[PDB]
């Protein structure tokens, strides 16, 4: 289970990759990076614009492809694939369940190996 | 037909008016999406066949909310009835309405007055208790293959003082009251 970790979304910037830390659109006191976290029976999908969604994997459709690729369907379609396994960097391609529109396809760092800075995102440009 | 209980037709325009979330790369980067609530509501108005010049922030709006006290100090009740009437007559013509909401509860930042809008797209009743359906552009969550902001539990309830108050399906903490009605402009040459 290579996908089993807290995956923090990274953003490429002019000064290198960072983990942005967002005050949530629903509640400015809730401040967190975006992430996908898989620990046992749970898949947590957390964006900057909504409360985190914690899905029970016992109701999910889970498939494994080749080369340690995996997909999970709850209310969204999540596909995991390594990007740089030595740097513990993976990509989560997140789509609607019809697979018609891609929602995001960020790179992520396993939080246990994260060396990028956590930078508090500043909404008021 | 007309409803026995409430005496009006029940209306649900959702199948004719596509939903739009504000959390969409068509509005730009995250910082632009963050302030795109009005723009997404305007996409919904043009999805319904109205002019892109609809819902200006000018003196045609119906301004219901005005700036030890009563609970109704900031509500103009005559304007509340006017806004209600305009909503009923647009829905009966087949058009949605873009409205501004304030928070009874669950503001994302009580220290600020960030403008928020929703779009009313329907009307019904339960035992003569009138409700209005709305599209909430302020969510990107999806469920059962659709956006949560298009779900039928996005309902405003008509209160005894003719204000409209309710809760979006994606965030049970938010309690809206409708404080501003913006005007539709038809697609006409002159
Ligand atoms: Ca009725």
Residues of A in contact with B139 (CB under 8 A): 49-50
Residue of B nearest to A104 (CA): B25
Q: How far, in Å, are A11, B7, B50, B136 from residue B121 at the CA level?
A: 37, 19, 14, 11
Q: Which helix (H) or strand (E) holds B103?
A: strand B97-105
Q: Is A67 among the domain residues?
A: yes
CA distance B113 to B103: 9
CA distance B141 to B23: 10
CA distance B118 to B110: 19
CA distance B144 to B91: 27
**Ligand 1 midpoint to CA B181 (Å):** 23
Name the nearest CA neighbour of A30 among A6, A48, A54, A11: A48
Residue A9, sorted as left (phi over 0), alpha (psi -120 to 50) or beta, turns out to be beta
Q: What are phi and psi of B135, to 5 degrees?
A: -100, 130
Q: Can you name the residues that pair with B2 across neighbouring β-strands?
A: B9
Residue B94, sorted as left (phi over 0), alpha (psi -120 to 50) or beta, turns out to be left
Q: How far, in Å, are B76, B112, B114, B170 from residue B109 at the CA level?
A: 25, 6, 8, 17
**B90: its two tokens:** 């647009």
Residues B114, B120, B125, B126, CA torsion sign: negative
Q: Is the distance from CB of B87 to CB of B7 less than 8 angstroms?
A: no
CA distance B21 to B151: 12
**B75: its two tokens:** 């509500």
Q: Is the distance from CB of B115 to CB of B190 less than 8 angstroms?
A: no
Structural domain boundaries of chain B? 11-181
Task: HSE, CB side, 13 Å, CA atoms: give it for residue A115.
Answer: 4
CA distance A89 to A108: 6
**A105: its two tokens:** 């396809």
Enumerate residues 6+ apart whose C-beta is below 8 A from A81. A67, A68, A69, A90, A91, A93
Q: Is the distance from CB of A9 to CB of A108 less than 8 angstroms?
A: yes
Q: How far is CA B25 from the centre of its chain?
A: 23
Q: Is A52 among the domain residues?
A: yes
Q: How far, in Å, are A38, A59, A62, A103, B10 from residue A97 at the CA level?
A: 19, 14, 13, 11, 31
Cross-chain residue pair B34–A25, CB shorter than 8 Å = yes
Q: Is A125 among the domain residues?
A: no
Q: Is the distance from CB of B122 to CB of B97 less than 8 angstroms?
A: no
Q: How far apart are the first and last CA of chain B?
A: 34
Q: How many domains does chain A have?
A: 1
Q: What are phi and psi of B14, to 5 degrees?
A: -60, -35
Q: Which helix (H) or strand (E) holds B92?
A: helix B77-93
Pairing of strands B11-12, A27-33: unpaired
Work out the burial of residue A81: count CB atoms within 10 Å of its CB; fewer than 13 is exposed, 13-18 middle, 19 or more buried: middle
Q: Is A1 among the domain residues?
A: no
Name the nearest CA neighbour of A53 among A66, A39, A65, A42: A42
Q: Does A51 touch chain B (CB under 8 A)?
A: yes
| Resolution attained, angstroms | 1.9
Experimental method: X-ray
Residues B121, B137, A50, B173, CA torsion sign: negative
Q: Which of A49, A76, A125 sits opposite B142 (nearest CB)?
A: A76
CA distance B130 to B132: 7
Enumerate residues 6+ apart whose C-beta is below 8 A from B129. B157, B158
Pairing of strands B129-135, B116-126: antiparallel
CA distance B70 to B51: 40
Q: Is A78 among the domain residues?
A: yes
DSSP string of A53-101?
EEEEGGGSEEEE-STT-EEEESSEEEEEEEEEGGGTEEEEEEEETTS-S
CB pairs under 8 A between A and B: 44
Q: How far is CA B180 from the centre of its chain?
A: 9
Angstroms from A14 CA to nearest CA on chain B: 16
CA torsion angle for B13, B18, B24, B28 (degrees, to 10)? -100
Q: Is A56 among the domain residues?
A: yes
Q: CB neighbours (10 Å) of residue B70? A: 7
Enumerate residues 6+ apart whose C-beta is below 8 A from B35. none
Segments forming the whole domain that contains residue A90: 6-120
Q: How far is CA A124 from the centre of its chain?
A: 24
Q: What are phi and psi of B148, to 5 degrees?
A: -60, -35
Q: Is B63 helix (H, G, I), strand (E, B) or coil?
A: strand
């Amino acid at each position: 289970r290579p996908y089993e970790a807290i995956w923090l979304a990274i953003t490429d910037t002019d000064s290198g990759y960072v983990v942005y830390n967002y005050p949530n659109f629903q509640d400015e006191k809730m401040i967190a990076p975006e992430y996908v976290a898989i620990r046992n029976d749970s898949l947590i999908y957390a964006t900057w614009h909504d409360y985190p969604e914690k899905f029970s994997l016992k109701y999910a459709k889970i498939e494994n492809g080749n080369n340690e690729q995996y997909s999970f369907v709850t209310e969204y379609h999540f596909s995991f694939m390594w990007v740089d396994k030595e740097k513990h960097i993976a990509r989560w391609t997140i789509s609607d369940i019809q697979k018609k529109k891609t929602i995001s396809n960020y790179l992520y760092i396993d939080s246990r190996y994260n060396t990028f800075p956590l930078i508090d995102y500043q909404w008021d440009e | 037909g007309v409803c026995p209980l409430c005496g009006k037709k029940h209306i649900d325009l959702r199948s004719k008016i596509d939903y739009q979330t504000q959390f969409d790369s068509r509005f730009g980067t995250k910082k632009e999406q963050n302030v795109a609530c009005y723009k997404a509501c305007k996409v919904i108005l043009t999805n319904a066949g109205l002019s892109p010049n609809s819902a200006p922030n000018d003196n045609t709006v119906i301004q219901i909310g005005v700036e030890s006290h009563s609970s109704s100090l900031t509500i103009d009740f005559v304007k509340a009835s006017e806004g209600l009437n305009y909503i009923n007559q647009q829905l009966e013509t087949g058009y949605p309405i873009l409205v501004g909401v304030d928070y009874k509860a669950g503001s994302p930042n009580s220290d600020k007055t960030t403008d928020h809008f929703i779009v009313i797209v329907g009307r019904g009743c339960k035992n003569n208790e009138v409700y209005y359906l709305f599209y909430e552009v302020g969510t990107g969550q999806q469920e059962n293959g659709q956006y949560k902001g298009a779900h039928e539990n996005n309902k405003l309830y008509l209160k005894k003082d003719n204000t409209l108050q309710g809760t979006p399906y994606h965030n049970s903490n938010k309690k809206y009251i409708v404080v501003q009605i913006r005007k539709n402009i038809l697609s006409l040459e002159h």
